[PDB]
Amino acid sequence: DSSRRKWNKTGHAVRAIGRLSSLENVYIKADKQKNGIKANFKIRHNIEDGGVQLAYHYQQNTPIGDGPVLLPDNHYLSVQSKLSKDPNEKRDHMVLLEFVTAAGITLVSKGEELFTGVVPILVELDGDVNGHKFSVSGEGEGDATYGKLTLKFICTTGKLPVPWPTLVTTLVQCFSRYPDHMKQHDFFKSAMPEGYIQERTIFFKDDGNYKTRAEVKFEGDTLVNRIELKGIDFKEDGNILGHKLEYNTRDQLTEEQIAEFKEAFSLFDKDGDGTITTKELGTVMRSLGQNPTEAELQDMINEVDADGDGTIDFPEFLTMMARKMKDTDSEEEIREAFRVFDKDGNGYISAAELRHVMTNLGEKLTDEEVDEMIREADIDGDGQVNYEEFVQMMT
Amino acid sequence: DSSRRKWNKTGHAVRAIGRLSSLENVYIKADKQKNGIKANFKIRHNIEDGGVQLAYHYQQNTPIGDGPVLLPDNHYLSVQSKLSKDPNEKRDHMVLLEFVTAAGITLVSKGEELFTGVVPILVELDGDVNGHKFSVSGEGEGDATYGKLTLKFICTTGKLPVPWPTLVTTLVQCFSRYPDHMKQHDFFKSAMPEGYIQERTIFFKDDGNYKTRAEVKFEGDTLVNRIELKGIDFKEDGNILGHKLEYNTRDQLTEEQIAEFKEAFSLFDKDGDGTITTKELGTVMRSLGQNPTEAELQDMINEVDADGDGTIDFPEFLTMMARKMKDTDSEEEIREAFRVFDKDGNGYISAAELRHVMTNLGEKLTDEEVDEMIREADIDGDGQVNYEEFVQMMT
Ligand SMILES: [Ca+2]
Ligand SMILES: [Ca+2]
Ligand SMILES: [Ca+2]
Ligand SMILES: [Ca+2]
Ligand SMILES: [Ca+2]
Ligand SMILES: [Ca+2]
Ligand SMILES: [Ca+2]
Ligand SMILES: [Ca+2]
């Protein structure tokens, strides 16, 4: 028992270090003598059937141009990535969706202005890993308002000789969302349009290393990332050349699921600036009839406020919504949602109640559209939605 | 399909408001004309078989003494409560464990000094709810270093005529942990030892209300909370008089489980000040052989840093450790823990490796004690711990 107590106590401490050190954030610092920045970070690539392959990243960025750029105070980028496949694509490929935000500093230039909308992206990579030459082309778009990248990459030489996850960091940090109060620390956009050179060494623990040099710049209205990669000293049946790295998980939100959350987000972010402020959150809650104090509104946002900017951005909203609930918690959540829709609390959402809720949220739907929502949910043909019918629409 | 899309989009927005507004924090503001404070908060009491009973709290505190107290800027308290039963207690009772911390303001007085250790607590309550008179006595201790209360309450008049959860807020906020940078906002300790009067109105939605007046002061070295409660207009078979409120859940950490996490916490908090600083976290990680930058250490703490003080307190540590993992995540966590113990990575934790890990964590164990840990884990009698043996000790 005392021995058991000792294993538990020290087990907890060791697992606590594991939980704390689970982050894979990109730490950025100025490099004033090169008029640019350096970064360091550690990617943890899951190995098939358990374990992690560590990839230690050392990064340097220097502007192509001769002029002023923003040299930042220390801060970091936080990345959410989702890798998937196109079922209609026969070539070796990767579909990638990424959300990237800056943080670590507590509470419009010509470079900034280039990123205020959706920007087309081209990526070209020529690689040579242990003598295996290969090429990758990618295209898609970046929307820095939401820190969002959506891209599809093809191996144009045939089968990719390394796992796709090992190339993600190499294959445009100018698309990261920097909150307003960190705008003076955004080196990446400040170097645009002439662009920057991004170089890395990536050391795969107990295995080989990649050395990468990329030119990141606008060519016309397209942001282009042109990359040369060299890998050396890889083990022929290590995790990289032996393709023993997990591609993704079954347990990840779909691109279209994320898209539905983006539509929900826009109901709060009515000015489309990519943030929900206390004013905006209160506006919606007040329209639904609730009355939060400024203190409650500040605290509610603070709870999910990863970067401490006092607002909810889309990646923060996604984190909150992506969180899976205990099935008993989920039930109570749906029960509470029903209560919001059933305004008079009589156990039935009427068509009139549903029209009002749509109006209060800021949805614009015709009465006919609302009737179609009623028809979709109604099982017993009374033209109203009871609790169990509502559960089917929330499930 | 379009109708379905509409239910999903608006469902997400409504559930998002539910997730955001799930907090039950205690909002405190100064009341300068009464030389004290006011507070407002909304408790959500789970109803048996689903739903919530709301209890709207309005609070006022005024010092008993004539002298100076600290009148705070706006801030809040965050509470974790665990209600349980004593299997050896035959009377109607409640065992309560609470952790309370202050937050909401961004980065030793004689009153403060009274709370630097463990302080005995007595609680006395005389109540009268719809004419039903009853009394409650409680005793235990408070340890503000960890924001911790542990108390047991007995109904001394027989059966309690209201549910125990409805009395928790009434039955010593001087035991809240205020971080160093908020010390000038701690009204509760500043009024000690002469104490304060705490008054509330508590409105149970669609039901009756409690009016409470309490005197909170030291009597000798004991912190005493003496309370008069009056309830009126309750519904005879509403949720309160009808006893339809859930007492607790099966899914809560045990008092002794929490105690094991406290022992683990003390390995990092080697100076016993109730916080883990970047210096302390780095010290342990460096002893285990790891090398985090100051940036990594700051970021790791920030991730779990509820109050933004730059350190991990015990309730923050508990939140991190209490979080339940997907069984696949838990497996990888245990795999990674094994790797920390198996220093040379050969698949076996030797006795010598285990002795070193104990030393590196700052555990003080004899070689004999370490041998007993080996014996506890060893299934195949080689005197070492392989991975599957280790899994049995982590499970
Ligand atoms: Ca906005
Ligand atoms: Ca934010
Ligand atoms: Ca209704
Ligand atoms: Ca119906
Ligand atoms: Ca400490
Ligand atoms: Ca903290
Ligand atoms: Ca070993
Ligand atoms: Ca063994």
Name the residue among B280, B249, B244, B251 with its Cα closest to residue B265.
B280
Distance separating alpha carbons of residues B394 and A10, to the nearest angstrom: 10
Q: Do B20 and A300 touch (CB under 8 A)?
A: yes
Residue A237: strand, helix, or coil: coil
Q: Which of residues 218-247 of B touch A (CB under 8 A)?
A: none
From first CA to last CA, the distance across chain B in angstroms is 45
All residues of chain B having their beta carbon less than 8 Å from the beta carbon of residue A367 are none
Interface contact A375, partner B, CB < 8 A: yes
Closest-CA residue of chain A to B300: A20
Structure tokens at B304: 């779990």
Give the H or E element holding residue A137. strand A132-143
Residue A323: strand, helix, or coil: coil
State the burial class of residue B34 (Cβ atoms within 10 Å of its Cβ: 0-12, 13-18, 19+): middle
Closest ligand to residue A345's CA: 3
Q: Do B299 and A333 touch (CB under 8 A)?
A: no
What residues are paired with B132 via a beta bridge? B129
Residue A364: strand, helix, or coil: coil
Structure tokens at A24: 């894979």
Q: Do A292 and B21 touch (CB under 8 A)?
A: yes
Among partner residues B11, B17, B300, which is closest to A393 by beta-carbon distance?
Answer: B11
Name the residue among A117, A113, A115, A133 with its Cα closest to residue A125.
A133
Structure tokens at B355: 């002795």
Instruction: Confirm if B254 and B87 have CB atoms less than 8 A apart.
Output: no
Q: What's the gap in Å between the CA of B76 and the closest CA on chain A?
A: 9
State the burial class of residue B126 (Cβ atoms within 10 Å of its Cβ: 0-12, 13-18, 19+): middle
What residues are paired with B312 via a beta bridge? B276
Structure tokens at A113: 């202005």
User: What is the Å distance from ligand 2's center to A316 Cα?
Assistant: 7
Cis peptide before B63 (omega within 30 of 0): no
CA atoms in the 13 A half-sphere facing the CB of A355:
8
B58-93 as b/e: b if 16+ CB within 10 A: ebbbbbeeeeebbbbeebbbbbbbbbeeeeeeeebb
Q: Which of residues 96-125 of A touch B (CB under 8 A)?
A: 104, 106-107
Sign of CA dihedral B349, B354, B356, B358: positive
Q: Which of residues 281-340 of B touch A (CB under 8 A)?
A: 281, 284-285, 288, 290, 292-293, 295-296, 298-304, 308, 317, 320-321, 323, 326, 331-337, 340
Q: What's the gap in Å between the CA of B59 and the closest CA on chain A?
A: 16
Please state, in angstroms and as integers, the Cα–Cα distance from residue A305 to each residue in A23, A60, B150, B306, following that order: 17, 29, 32, 11
Phi, psi of A254 (to 5 degrees): -85, 160
CATH code at A1-253: 2.40.155.10
Instruction: Confirm if B230 and B236 have CB atoms less than 8 A apart.
Output: no
Q: Do A299 and B23 touch (CB under 8 A)?
A: yes
Distance separating alpha carbons of residues B368 and B355, to the nearest angstrom: 10
Q: Which of residues 152-171 of B touch A (CB under 8 A)?
A: none
Instruction: Confirm if B77 and B177 have CB atoms less than 8 A apart.
Output: no
Q: Do A363 and B9 touch (CB under 8 A)?
A: yes
Interface contact A23, partner B, CB < 8 A: yes
Q: What's the gap in Å between the CA of A291 and the closest CA on chain B?
A: 11
Q: Do A299 and B76 touch (CB under 8 A)?
A: yes
B294-316 as b/e: b if 16+ CB within 10 A: ebbbbbbbbbbbbbbbbbbbbbb
Q: Do B9 and A260 touch (CB under 8 A)?
A: yes
Q: List the resolution, Å.
A: 1.5
Residues having C-beta closer than 5 Å to ion ligand 6 = B 305, 307, 309, 311
Instruction: Confirm if A370 and A356 have CB atoms less than 8 A apart.
Output: no
Closest ligand to residue A310's CA: 2
3-state secondary structure chain B: CHHHHHHHHHHHHHHHHHHHCCCCCEEEEEEHHHCEEEEEEEEEEEECCCCEEEEEEEEEEEECCCCCCCCCCCEEEEEEEEEECCCCCCCCEEEEEEEEEEECCCCCCHHHHCCCCEEEEEEEEEEEECCEEEEEEEEEEEEHHHCEEEEEEEECCCCCCCCHHHHCCCCCHHHCECCHHHHHHCHHHHCCCCCEEEEEEEEECCCCEEEEEEEEEEECCEEEEEEEEEEECCCCCCCCCCCCECCCCCCCCCHHHHHHHHHHHHHHCCCCCCEECHHHHHHHHHHCCCCCCHHHHHHHHHHHCCCCCCCEEHHHHHHHHHCCCCHHHHHHHHHHHHHHHCCCCCCEECHHHHHHHHHHHCCCCCHHHHHHHHHHHCCCCCCCEEHHHHHHHCC
Name the residue among B221, B22, B258, B235 with its Cα closest to residue B141.
B221
Interface contact A264, partner B, CB < 8 A: yes
Closest ligand to residue A266's CA: 1
Q: What residues contact B268, with CB distance under 8 A and at least 6 apart?
A: A13, A16, B276, B280, B281, B284, B312
A195 backbone φψ class: left, alpha, beta (φ>0; ψ -120 to 50): left
Q: Do A74 and B295 touch (CB under 8 A)?
A: yes
Distance separating alpha carbons of residues B234 and B207, to the nearest angstrom: 5
Instruction: Confirm if B95 and B152 have CB atoms less than 8 A apart.
Output: yes
Name the residue among A287, A286, A312 with its Cα closest to residue A299.
A312
Distance separating alpha carbons of residues A201 and A209, to the nearest angstrom: 7
Closest-CA residue of chain A to B12: A264
All residues of chain A having their beta carbon less than 8 Å from the beta carbon of residue B321 are 12, 15-16, 19
User: What is the Å distance from ligand 1's center to A147 Cα?
Assistant: 15
- β-strands A222-232, A275-276: how paired? unpaired
Q: Do A337 and B14 touch (CB under 8 A)?
A: yes
B201-211 as b/e: b if 16+ CB within 10 A: ebbbeebbbbe
Distance separating alpha carbons of residues B100 and B76, to the nearest angstrom: 10
Name the residue among B226, B228, B230, B237 with its Cα closest to residue B209.
B230
What technique was this entry resolved by? X-ray
User: What is the Å distance from ligand 8's center to B374 Cα?
Assistant: 8
From first CA to last CA, the distance across chain A in angstroms is 45
Picking from A2, A5, A7, A335 by the largest number of B CB atoms within 10 A of its own CB, the best residue to mutate is: A7
Per domain, the residue ranges of chain B are 1-253, 254-395
Distance separating alpha carbons of residues A389 and A50, to the nearest angstrom: 42
Residue A258: strand, helix, or coil: helix
Q: Do B304 and A20 touch (CB under 8 A)?
A: yes
User: What is the Å distance from ligand 1's center to A363 Cα?
Assistant: 16
All residues of chain B having their beta carbon less than 8 Å from the beta carbon of residue A377 are 7
